[PDB]
Design a protein around this motif. Structure first.
Motif, short mmCIF file in Angstrom:
data_model
loop_
_atom_site.label_atom_id
_atom_site.label_comp_id
_atom_site.label_asym_id
_atom_site.label_seq_id
_atom_site.Cartn_x
_atom_site.Cartn_y
_atom_site.Cartn_z
N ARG A 218 3.84 -3.47 2.87
CA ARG A 218 3.97 -4.87 3.34
C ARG A 218 2.65 -5.32 4.01
N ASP A 222 3.46 -9.00 8.47
CA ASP A 222 4.82 -9.25 8.04
C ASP A 222 5.85 -8.44 8.80
N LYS A 224 9.22 -9.01 9.01
CA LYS A 224 10.49 -8.89 8.32
C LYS A 224 10.45 -7.92 7.15
N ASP A 226 9.41 -9.17 3.89
CA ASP A 226 9.65 -9.85 2.60
C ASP A 226 8.50 -9.73 1.62
N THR A 227 7.32 -9.36 2.08
CA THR A 227 6.19 -9.19 1.18
C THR A 227 6.12 -7.76 0.62
#
Ligand SMILES: *[C@@H]1O[C@H](CO)[C@@H](O)[C@H](O)[C@H]1NC(C)=O
Ligand SMILES: CS[C@@H]1[C@@H](N)[C@@H](O)[C@@H](O)[C@H]1O
Ligand SMILES: [Zn+2]
Length: 1014
Positions: A218, A222, A224, A226-227
């Motif tokens: 990631r 980031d 969270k 999500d990447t």
């Protein structure tokens, strides 16, 4: 939107933290030289839990290296592809992966319809699988993210059109170090998995020990996840066969069946492969399965990836047979011997990942999270690959000039549909393909042979000509009354004028606007602004008289400044580097104001004497024993003086103080603030006399750099109302500091001449208490925190500077933005340094077989931004990222995407209009329309236009700034019938948008949209 500044992500492996803890000792680990003797429990695998092994045939094909793209295609790649089609067609069980679409497209268009159908069939049935699918396997250090996306899109669009497939697994086995910009772009382009190989040998050992070679990668900011993109890092020193079957290359080399003799390859560990037979298959299988089980110990599932390939492999028909048949004998025996508890077969990359994820889903493994990068790479001992961050710098700068020209040509022409006869699509495809080709890991990197660099340069030259043609045809159509517009698609209505490429002293390529009472009294010029906000920028043109004034198209006067045209020469007679002033041409400068993604027209008119709204710069030549410098018709006389310290201030701007040597000494932000010490200095690094030598890849200095002996340099000071500058002729560099009211611009005309074994570096010395911390960018996309480590050698503390770098303490920050990727570091608190050029007489033993002795003059450009940051909201001490301020980001945009300048070529432009784009929204400053591209030809009933929107993240430092318009790209063109969010390559629709409105994106995010028009 996720907050990218205040929340430190919690990840299992954060590379800056890992680097801080690791020892980096280089001990002999036995047959796995950089590892240890791997042990496994033979009872781990049994009838109910077998090891599944996928042997993946591959052929690494460089689109230029020791030969040019066309030479390798003719001598090797067309044969590899031709025999892959034959052998896969004839042997249903055989598999092969392919990465470089430039070569595949080159091959496929030369096939007859029957072979095309056979090829489509082996792709559709899974035998031939494309991995990544980019035009090339790009460099990840020097490349701009925009061009990494451009090349990915070029190859994937070709694949969707002709092969009806879109890869979701990436294969990057050769770039020299790896960047998180790749999973960022891939995960937003539909990918689910990626593979990397060239990472520091100490990193491979550390991660192998913890079984962290497979991870969810990631971005550093980031929180969270999500990447995140699943990533597989190979464990060993190379991707060749000796280093892909297990930890012992002496054993693995025996399983590369191309090494028995007739092919001219052998095993350096002295034991050759032997044909597999019924009498030796048991012993050979014992040996091979043992390597596989050792390699399987470094990973978490019961699915093992065994690449089978090397450079330009699978060429000869006999090579396909020798590899295929010997491996099929090994599989038939191993798979039938229950005590091995192995099931081995040929496979593809996707097949491997699919099996890994099925095991994950069955709860058989969980994977660690990871953020950071994998620079700077070292393959052994102290051999750090930081040299290619600078090698062949002329082409590295050219890369960024073409990057912008491609963006401008695609955007300018996107506004209308063009008749096929205008050959707009043809020229743009050529421009995109030659720029895409140069992203190859031997292109922009400067690691190819001399004649290959020549080929990439010639291609890019043609690409720039193609962009110019499209841009100038577009300006004429955008600014000419429709009922008067009458184009000849082969004619040149405008010529582009570029102040910084190839640059003064590099090539005298700029045309002079010739005016005269008895010939042509005036000339129309036009500026384009590719950015989505209103923009003012000083622009300059060469004119044949100093008596010239400027008006806009409402005939409103525009303030201008005229200065001489100065050129520097090495006077072989006097042995001094000094400036000569033109007696036949002059420079006019004025502020152009251009709408967002638009055009503005201005007029240059000659007169007999000084015009009311034009001022003249004063000039001062500082040197002992001066000689006259007449300037043809220039009004004011040049002044002379002995060298001395000088200070300059343009407008309300900062006040810069310079040494008697013409180099910056201090910067005073406001008239009452302190003169902050900021010193430019040029030094040189040498090469080792005994031991390993620096080459195109490797930087192996013989100690800290030594000061360049400057002598008593000639210094030229030009002081104007709108622009001033101090220029100095130093050995190998004409260094110039330009002031226009804000951060200065630096320009270096770098000519290393015949100084063999020398690397010239430009250093900034300050008293900023940065300690061991500094920041550099990755692909022009993000800034990452670096920590200087004295446990690593100097060359290891060098990082890519693709677009910028900075240092800061609690109160002050100094940021250097670049118009070209170069290598750099901060080797002591308060310092910044960046390499200018390097000339090396030896080869560095990686196969290039030559040093770097093809240097040519290059004009490097920069912006130097000193600013107070005690009031900025910055990330905490543990956050791995850094962010630019508004001033620094705009300064970077000024170097990478300046206004474009067009000079009308005929005497009279009938139907001329004053502006285009006045009604375009002026978007918030952190937002950019990275790409605007019409995706359909004119015969399409439904036209489609694609946009890539990117929002960076800028530091909040107390500046209100709040008056901008929402930018909805889907309504930039009329008659919109639909708006879709798509993958970044525009190949898959992800969301049908309500109201046909394209939302803006969050800080640090990039989205793509496609609007359809009926
Ligand atoms: C292209 O690929 C998709 C997915 O397999 C398939 O359904 C389609 O029929 C193929 N051919 C076309 C129509 O492009
Ligand atoms: C091992 S050196 C590397 C070679 N693998 C070749 O593919 C080329 O890209 C070069 O720079
Ligand atoms: Zn390569």
């Amino acid at each position: 939107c996720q907050d990218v500044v205040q929340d430190v992500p919690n990840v299992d492996v954060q590379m800056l933290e890992l680097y801080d803890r690791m020892s980096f000792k280089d001990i002999d680990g036995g047959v796995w030289k950089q590892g240890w003797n791997i042990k496994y429990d033979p009872l781990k695998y049994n009838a109910h839990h077998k090891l599944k092994v996928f042997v993946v045939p591959h052929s690494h094909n460089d689109p230029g290296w020791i030969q040019t793209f066309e030479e390798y295609y003719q001598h090797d790649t067309k044969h590899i592809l031709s025999n892959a089609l034959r052998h896969l067609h004839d042997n249903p069980e055989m598999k092969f992966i392919w990465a470089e679409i430039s070569y595949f497209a080159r091959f496929y268009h030369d096939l007859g319809e029957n072979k095309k159908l056979q090829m489509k069939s082996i792709v559709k049935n899974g035998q031939l699988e494309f991995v990544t699918g980019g035009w090339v396997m790009p460099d990840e250090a020097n490349s701009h993210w925009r061009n990494v996306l451009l090349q990915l899109t070029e190859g994937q669009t070709w694949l969707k059109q002709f092969m009806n497939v879109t890869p979701t697994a990436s294969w990057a086995i050769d770039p020299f170090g790896h960047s998180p910009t790749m999973p960022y772009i891939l995960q937003k382009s539909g990918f689910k998995n990626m593979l990397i190989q060239r990472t520091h040998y100490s990193v491979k050992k550390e991660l192998a020990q913890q079984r962290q070679l497979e991870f969810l990668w990631r971005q550093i900011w980031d929180n969270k996840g999500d990447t995140a993109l699943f990533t597989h890092m190979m464990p060993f020193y190379s991707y060749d066969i000796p280093h892909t079957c297990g930890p012992d290359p002496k054993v693995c080399c025996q399983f590369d069946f191309k090494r028995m003799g007739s092919f001219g390859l052998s095993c350096p560990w002295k034991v050759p492969p032997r044909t597999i037979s019924d009498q030796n298959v048991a012993a050979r299988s014992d040996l091979l399965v043992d390597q596989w089980k050792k390699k399987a110990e470094l990973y978490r599932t019961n699915v093992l990836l065994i690449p089978l390939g090397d450079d330009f492999r699978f060429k000869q028909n006999t090579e396909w047979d020798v590899q295929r048949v010997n491996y099929e004998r090994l599989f038939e025996h191993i798979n039938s011997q229950a005590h091995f508890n192995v099931q081995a077969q040929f496979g593809t990359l996707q097949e491997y990942f699919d099996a890994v994820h099925q095991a994950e889903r069955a709860g058989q493994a969980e994977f660690p999270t990871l953020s950071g990068d994998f620079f700077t790479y070292a393959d052994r001992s102290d051999n750090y690959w930081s040299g290619y961050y600078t090698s062949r710098p002329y082409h590295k700068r050219m890369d960024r000039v073409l990057m912008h020209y491609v963006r401008a040509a695609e955007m300018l022409s996107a506004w209308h549909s063009w008749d096929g006869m205008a050959r707009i699509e043809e020229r743009l495809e050529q421009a995109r393909r030659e720029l895409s080709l140069f992203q190859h890991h031997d292109g922009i990197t400067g690691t190819a042979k001399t004649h290959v660099v020549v080929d990439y340069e010639q291609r890019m030259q043609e690409a720039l000509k193609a962009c110019q043609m499209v841009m100038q045809q577009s300006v004429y159509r955008l600014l000419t009354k429709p009922s008067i517009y009458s184009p000849d698609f082969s004619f040149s209505y405008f010529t582009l004028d570029d102040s910084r490429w190839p640059g003064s002293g590099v090539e005298d390529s700029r045309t002079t606007i010739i005016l005269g009472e008895d010939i042509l009294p005036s000339k129309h010029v036009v500026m384009h602004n590719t950015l989505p906000h209103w923009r003012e920028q000083l622009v300059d043109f060469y004119v044949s008289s100093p008596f010239v004034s400027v008006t806009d198209l409402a005939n409103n006067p525009v303030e201008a400044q005229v200065s001489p045209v100065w050129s520097w020469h090495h006077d072989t007679l006097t042995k001094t580097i000094h400036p000569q002033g033109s007696t036949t041409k002059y420079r006019i400068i004025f502020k152009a104001r251009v709408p967002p993604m638009g055009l503005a027209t201005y007029v240059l008119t000659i007169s007999d004497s000084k015009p009311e709204h034009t001022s003249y710069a004063s000039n001062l030549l500082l040197r002992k024993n001066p000689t006259s410098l007449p300037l043809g018709q220039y009004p004011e006389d040049v002044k002379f003086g002995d060298p001395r310290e000088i200070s300059l201030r343009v407008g309300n701007g900062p006040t810069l103080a310079f040494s008697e040597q013409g180099l910056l000494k201090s910067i005073q932000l406001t008239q009452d603030s302190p003169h902050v010490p900021v010193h430019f200095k040029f030094l040189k690094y040498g090469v080792r006399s005994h031991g390993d030598r620096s080459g195109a890849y490797l930087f192996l200095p013989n100690g800290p750099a030594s000061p360049v002996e400057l002598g008593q340099p000639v210094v030229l000071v030009t002081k104007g109302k709108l622009e001033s500058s101090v220029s100095v002729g130093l050995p190998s560099v004409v260094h110039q500091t330009i002031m226009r009211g804000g951060a200065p611009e630096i320009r270096n005309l770098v000519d290393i001449g015949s100084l063999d074994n020398t690397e010239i570096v430009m250093r900034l010395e300050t008293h900023i208490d940065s300690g061991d911390i500094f920041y550099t960018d990755l692909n022009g996309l993000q800034f990452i925190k670096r920590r200087r480590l004295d446990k690593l050698p100097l060359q290891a503390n060098y990082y890519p500077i693709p677009s910028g770098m900075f240092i800061e303490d609690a109160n002050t920050r100094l940021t250097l933005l670049t118009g070209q990727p170069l290598g750099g570091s901060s080797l002591a608190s308060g310092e910044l340094e960046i390499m200018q050029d390097r000339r090396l007489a030896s080869d560095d033993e990686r196969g290039l077989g030559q040093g770097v002795l093809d240097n040519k003059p290059v004009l490097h450009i920069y912006r130097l931004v000193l600013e107070k940051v005690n009031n900025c909201v910055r990330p905490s001490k543990l956050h791995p990222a850094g962010y630019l301020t508004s001033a620094a980001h705009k300064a970077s945009q000024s170097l990478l995407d300046p206004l474009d300048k067009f000079i009308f070529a005929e005497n009279e432009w009938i139907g001329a209009q004053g502006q285009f784009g006045g009604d375009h929204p002026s978007a918030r400053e952190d937002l950019d329309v990275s790409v605007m591209r019409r995706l359909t030809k004119s015969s399409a009933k439904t036209q489609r236009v694609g946009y890539v929107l990117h929002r960076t993240n800028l530091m909040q430092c107390g500046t209100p700034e709040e008056h901008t318009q929402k930018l909805d790209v889907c309504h930039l063109l009329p008659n919109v019938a639909r708006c879709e969010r798509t993958t970044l390559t525009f190949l898959q629709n992800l969301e049908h948008l309500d109201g046909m409105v394209a939302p803006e994106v969050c800080p640090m995010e990039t989205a793509a949209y496609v609007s359809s028009h009926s």
